[PDB]
Short mmCIF file of N, CA and C in Angstrom, two decimals:
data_model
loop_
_atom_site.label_atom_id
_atom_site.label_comp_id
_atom_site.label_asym_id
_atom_site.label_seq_id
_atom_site.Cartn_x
_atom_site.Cartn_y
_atom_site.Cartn_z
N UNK A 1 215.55 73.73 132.83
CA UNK A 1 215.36 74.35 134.14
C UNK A 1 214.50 73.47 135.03
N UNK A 2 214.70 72.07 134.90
CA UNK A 2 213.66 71.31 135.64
C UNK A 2 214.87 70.35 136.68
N UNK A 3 214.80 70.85 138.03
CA UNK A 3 215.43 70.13 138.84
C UNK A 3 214.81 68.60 139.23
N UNK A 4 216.27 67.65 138.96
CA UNK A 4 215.96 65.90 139.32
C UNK A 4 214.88 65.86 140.51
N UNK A 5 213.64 64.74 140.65
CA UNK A 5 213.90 64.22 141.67
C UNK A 5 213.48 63.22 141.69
N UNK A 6 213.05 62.23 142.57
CA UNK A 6 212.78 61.37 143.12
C UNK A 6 211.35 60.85 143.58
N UNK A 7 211.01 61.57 144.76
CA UNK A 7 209.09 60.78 145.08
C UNK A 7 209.08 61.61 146.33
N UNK A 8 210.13 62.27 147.75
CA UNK A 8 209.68 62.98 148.30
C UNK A 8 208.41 62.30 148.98
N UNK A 9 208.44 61.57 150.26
CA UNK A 9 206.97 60.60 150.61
C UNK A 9 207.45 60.36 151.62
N UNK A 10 208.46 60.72 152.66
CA UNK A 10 208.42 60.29 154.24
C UNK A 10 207.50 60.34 155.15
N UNK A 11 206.45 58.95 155.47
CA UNK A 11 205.35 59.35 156.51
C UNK A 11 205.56 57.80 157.44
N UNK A 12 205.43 57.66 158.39
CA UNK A 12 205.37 56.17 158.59
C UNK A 12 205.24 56.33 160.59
N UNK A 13 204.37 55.55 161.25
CA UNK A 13 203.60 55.45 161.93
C UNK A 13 202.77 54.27 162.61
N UNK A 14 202.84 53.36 163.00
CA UNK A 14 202.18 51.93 163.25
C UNK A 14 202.61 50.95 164.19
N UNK A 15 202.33 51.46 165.68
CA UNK A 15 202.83 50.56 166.51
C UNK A 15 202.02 50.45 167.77
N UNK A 16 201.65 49.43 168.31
CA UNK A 16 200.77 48.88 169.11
C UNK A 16 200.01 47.22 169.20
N UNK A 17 200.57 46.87 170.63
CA UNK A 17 199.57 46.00 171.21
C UNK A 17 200.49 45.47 172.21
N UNK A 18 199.85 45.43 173.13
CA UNK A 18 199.74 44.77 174.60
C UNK A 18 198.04 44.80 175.58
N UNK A 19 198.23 43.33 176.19
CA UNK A 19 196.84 43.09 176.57
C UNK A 19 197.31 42.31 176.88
N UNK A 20 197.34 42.31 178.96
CA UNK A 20 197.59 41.10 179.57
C UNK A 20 197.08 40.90 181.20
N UNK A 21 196.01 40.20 181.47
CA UNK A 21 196.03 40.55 183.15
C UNK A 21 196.34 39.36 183.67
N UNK A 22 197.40 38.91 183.27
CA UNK A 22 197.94 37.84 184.03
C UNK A 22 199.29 37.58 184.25
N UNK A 23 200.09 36.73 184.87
CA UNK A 23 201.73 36.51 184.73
C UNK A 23 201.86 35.94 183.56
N UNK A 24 201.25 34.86 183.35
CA UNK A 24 201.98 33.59 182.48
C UNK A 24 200.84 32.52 182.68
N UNK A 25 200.44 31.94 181.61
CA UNK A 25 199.59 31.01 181.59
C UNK A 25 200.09 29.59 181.33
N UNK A 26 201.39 29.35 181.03
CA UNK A 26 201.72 28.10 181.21
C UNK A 26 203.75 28.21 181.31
N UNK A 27 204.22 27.40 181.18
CA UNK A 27 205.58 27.69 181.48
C UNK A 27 206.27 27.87 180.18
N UNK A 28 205.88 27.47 179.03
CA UNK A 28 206.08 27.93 177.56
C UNK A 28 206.24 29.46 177.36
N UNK A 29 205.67 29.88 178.64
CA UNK A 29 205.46 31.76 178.78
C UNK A 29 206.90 32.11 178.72
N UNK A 30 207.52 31.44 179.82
CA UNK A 30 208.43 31.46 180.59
C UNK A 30 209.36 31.49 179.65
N UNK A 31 211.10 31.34 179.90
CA UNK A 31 211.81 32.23 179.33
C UNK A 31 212.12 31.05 178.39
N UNK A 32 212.85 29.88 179.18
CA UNK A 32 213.13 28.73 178.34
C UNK A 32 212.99 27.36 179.40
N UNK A 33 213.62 26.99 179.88
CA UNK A 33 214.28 26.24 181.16
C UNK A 33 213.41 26.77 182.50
N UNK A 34 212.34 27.35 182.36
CA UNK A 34 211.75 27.32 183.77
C UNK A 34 210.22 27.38 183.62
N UNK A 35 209.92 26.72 184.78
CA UNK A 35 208.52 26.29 185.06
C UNK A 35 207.19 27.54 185.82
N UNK A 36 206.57 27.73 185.59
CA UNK A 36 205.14 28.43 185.90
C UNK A 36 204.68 28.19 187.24
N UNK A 37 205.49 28.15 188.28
CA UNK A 37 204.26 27.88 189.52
C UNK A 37 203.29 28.31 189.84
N UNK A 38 202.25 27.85 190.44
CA UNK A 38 200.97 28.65 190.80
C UNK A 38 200.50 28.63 192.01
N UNK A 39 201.31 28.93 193.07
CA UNK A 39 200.87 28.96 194.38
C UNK A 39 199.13 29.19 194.91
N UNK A 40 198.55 28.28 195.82
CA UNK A 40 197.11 28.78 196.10
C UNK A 40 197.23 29.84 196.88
N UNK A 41 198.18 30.26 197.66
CA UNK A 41 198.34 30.87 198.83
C UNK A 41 198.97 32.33 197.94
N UNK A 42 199.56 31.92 196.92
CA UNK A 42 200.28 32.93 196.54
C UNK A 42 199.46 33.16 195.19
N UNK A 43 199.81 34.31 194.08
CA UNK A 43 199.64 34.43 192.88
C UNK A 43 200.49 33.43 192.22
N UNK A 44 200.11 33.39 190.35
CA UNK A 44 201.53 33.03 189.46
C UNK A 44 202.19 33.52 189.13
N UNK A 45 203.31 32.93 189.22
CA UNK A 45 204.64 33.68 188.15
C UNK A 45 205.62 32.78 187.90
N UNK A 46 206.49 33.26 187.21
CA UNK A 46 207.88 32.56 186.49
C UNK A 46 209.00 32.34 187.73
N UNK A 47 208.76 30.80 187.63
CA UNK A 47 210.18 30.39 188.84
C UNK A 47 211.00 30.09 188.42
N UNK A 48 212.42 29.55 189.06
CA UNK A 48 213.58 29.07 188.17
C UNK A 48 213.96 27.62 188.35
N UNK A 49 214.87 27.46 187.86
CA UNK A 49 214.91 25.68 187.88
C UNK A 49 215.23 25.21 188.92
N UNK A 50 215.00 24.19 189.49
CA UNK A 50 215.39 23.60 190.90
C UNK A 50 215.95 22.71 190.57
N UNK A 51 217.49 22.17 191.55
CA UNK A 51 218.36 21.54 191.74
C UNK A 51 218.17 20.53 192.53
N UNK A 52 218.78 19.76 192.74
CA UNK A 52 218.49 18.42 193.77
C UNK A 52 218.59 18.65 194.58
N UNK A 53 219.00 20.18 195.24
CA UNK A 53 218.51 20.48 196.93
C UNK A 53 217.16 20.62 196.78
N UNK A 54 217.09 21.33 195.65
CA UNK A 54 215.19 21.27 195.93
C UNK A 54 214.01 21.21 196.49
N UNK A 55 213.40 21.31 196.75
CA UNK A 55 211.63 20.31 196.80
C UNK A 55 211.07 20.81 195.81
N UNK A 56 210.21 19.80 195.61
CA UNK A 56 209.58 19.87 194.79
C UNK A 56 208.03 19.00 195.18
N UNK A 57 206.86 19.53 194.14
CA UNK A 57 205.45 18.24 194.72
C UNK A 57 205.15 17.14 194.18
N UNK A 58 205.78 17.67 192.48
CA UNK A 58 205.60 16.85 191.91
C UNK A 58 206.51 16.85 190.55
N UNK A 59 206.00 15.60 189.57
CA UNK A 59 207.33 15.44 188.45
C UNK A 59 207.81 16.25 187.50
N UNK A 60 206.74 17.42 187.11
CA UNK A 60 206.65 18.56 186.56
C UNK A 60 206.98 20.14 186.97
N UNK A 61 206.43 19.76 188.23
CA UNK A 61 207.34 20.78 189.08
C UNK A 61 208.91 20.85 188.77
N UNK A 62 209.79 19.97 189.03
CA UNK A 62 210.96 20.01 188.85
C UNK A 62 211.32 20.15 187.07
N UNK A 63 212.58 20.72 187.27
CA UNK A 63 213.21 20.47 185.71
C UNK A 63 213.13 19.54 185.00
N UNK A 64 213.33 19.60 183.67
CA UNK A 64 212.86 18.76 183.29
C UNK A 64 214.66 17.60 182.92
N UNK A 65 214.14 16.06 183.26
CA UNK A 65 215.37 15.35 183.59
C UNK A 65 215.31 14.94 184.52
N UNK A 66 214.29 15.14 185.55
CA UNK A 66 214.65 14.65 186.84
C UNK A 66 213.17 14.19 187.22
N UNK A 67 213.37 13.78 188.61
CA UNK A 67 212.48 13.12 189.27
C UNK A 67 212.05 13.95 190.49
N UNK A 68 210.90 13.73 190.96
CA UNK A 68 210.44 14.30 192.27
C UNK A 68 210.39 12.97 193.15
N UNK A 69 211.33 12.89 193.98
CA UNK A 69 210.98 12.03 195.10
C UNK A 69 211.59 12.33 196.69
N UNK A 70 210.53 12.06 197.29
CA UNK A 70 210.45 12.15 198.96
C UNK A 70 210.35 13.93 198.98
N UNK A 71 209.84 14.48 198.28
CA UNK A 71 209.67 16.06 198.04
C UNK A 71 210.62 16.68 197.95
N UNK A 72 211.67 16.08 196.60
CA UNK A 72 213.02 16.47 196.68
C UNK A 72 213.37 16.10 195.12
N UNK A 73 213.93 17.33 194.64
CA UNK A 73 214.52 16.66 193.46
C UNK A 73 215.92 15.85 193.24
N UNK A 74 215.82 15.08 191.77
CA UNK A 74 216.30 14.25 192.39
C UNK A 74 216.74 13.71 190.95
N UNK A 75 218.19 13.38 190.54
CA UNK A 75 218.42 12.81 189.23
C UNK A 75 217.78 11.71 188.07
N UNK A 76 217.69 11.57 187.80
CA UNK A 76 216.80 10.11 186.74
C UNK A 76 218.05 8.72 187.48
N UNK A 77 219.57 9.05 187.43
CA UNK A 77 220.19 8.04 187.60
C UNK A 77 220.38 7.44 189.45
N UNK A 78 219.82 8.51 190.03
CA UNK A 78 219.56 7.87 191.55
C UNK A 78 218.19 7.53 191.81
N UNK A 79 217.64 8.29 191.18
CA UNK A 79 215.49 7.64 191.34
C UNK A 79 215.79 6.10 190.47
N UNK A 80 215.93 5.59 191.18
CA UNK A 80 216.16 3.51 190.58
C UNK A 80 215.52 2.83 191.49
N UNK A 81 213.76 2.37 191.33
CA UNK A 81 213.53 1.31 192.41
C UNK A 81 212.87 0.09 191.59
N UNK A 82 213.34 -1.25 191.99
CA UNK A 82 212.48 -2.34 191.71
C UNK A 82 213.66 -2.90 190.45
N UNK A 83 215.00 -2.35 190.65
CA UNK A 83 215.74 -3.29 189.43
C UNK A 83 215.38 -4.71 189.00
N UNK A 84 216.22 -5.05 187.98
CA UNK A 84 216.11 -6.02 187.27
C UNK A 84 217.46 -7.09 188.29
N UNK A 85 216.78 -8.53 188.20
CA UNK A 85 217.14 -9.79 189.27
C UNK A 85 218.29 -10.09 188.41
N UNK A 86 217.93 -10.82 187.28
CA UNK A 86 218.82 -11.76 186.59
C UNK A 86 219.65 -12.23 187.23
N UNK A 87 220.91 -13.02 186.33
CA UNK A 87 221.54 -14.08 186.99
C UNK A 87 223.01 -14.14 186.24
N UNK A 88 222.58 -14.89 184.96
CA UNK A 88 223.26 -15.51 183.72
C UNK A 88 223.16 -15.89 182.63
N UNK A 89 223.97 -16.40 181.73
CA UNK A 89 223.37 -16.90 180.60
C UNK A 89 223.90 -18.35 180.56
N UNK A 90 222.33 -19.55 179.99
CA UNK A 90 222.91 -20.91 180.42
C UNK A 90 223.45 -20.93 178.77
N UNK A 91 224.87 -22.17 178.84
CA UNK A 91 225.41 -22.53 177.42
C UNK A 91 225.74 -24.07 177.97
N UNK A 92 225.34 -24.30 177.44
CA UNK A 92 226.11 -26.01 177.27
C UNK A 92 226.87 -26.06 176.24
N UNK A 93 227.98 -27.69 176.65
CA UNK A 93 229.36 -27.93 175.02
C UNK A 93 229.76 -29.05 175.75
N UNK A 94 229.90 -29.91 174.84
CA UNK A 94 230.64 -31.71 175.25
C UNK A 94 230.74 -32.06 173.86
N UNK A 95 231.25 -33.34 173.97
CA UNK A 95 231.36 -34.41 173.12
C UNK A 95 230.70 -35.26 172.77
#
């Protein structure tokens, strides 16, 4: 007259934490692919990637791959100044 059982123990309970008075403290915050601006004029927050219409202030500002120039983003393969001169290669051959 002794009914099966088991253990009978359903209790469970344990969830908490958030603590934040800020946007984002660096762009790692951020989702993946976008940068942290920090306006003086403005607060921070999470911006999105800028394109070569862009501006930008500086090299970090922009995505990453590219260049900031003339306050504009700007590809790695058009930011090219001060190439390389060269000429040829000398070979001499006779008899």
């Amino acid at each position: 007259m002794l009914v099966l059982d088991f253990n009978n123990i359903r209790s469970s309970a344990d969830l908490h934490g958030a603590r934040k008075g800020s946007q984002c403290l660096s762009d790692t915050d951020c989702n993946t692919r976008k940068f942290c601006l920090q306006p003086r004029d403005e607060k921070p927050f999470c911006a999105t990637c800028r394109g070569l219409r862009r501006r930008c202030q500086r090299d970090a500002m922009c995505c990453p791959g590219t260049l900031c120039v003339n306050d504009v983003c700007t590809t790695m393969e058009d930011a090219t100044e001060n190439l390389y001169f060269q000429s040829l290669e000398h070979h001499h051959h006779h008899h």
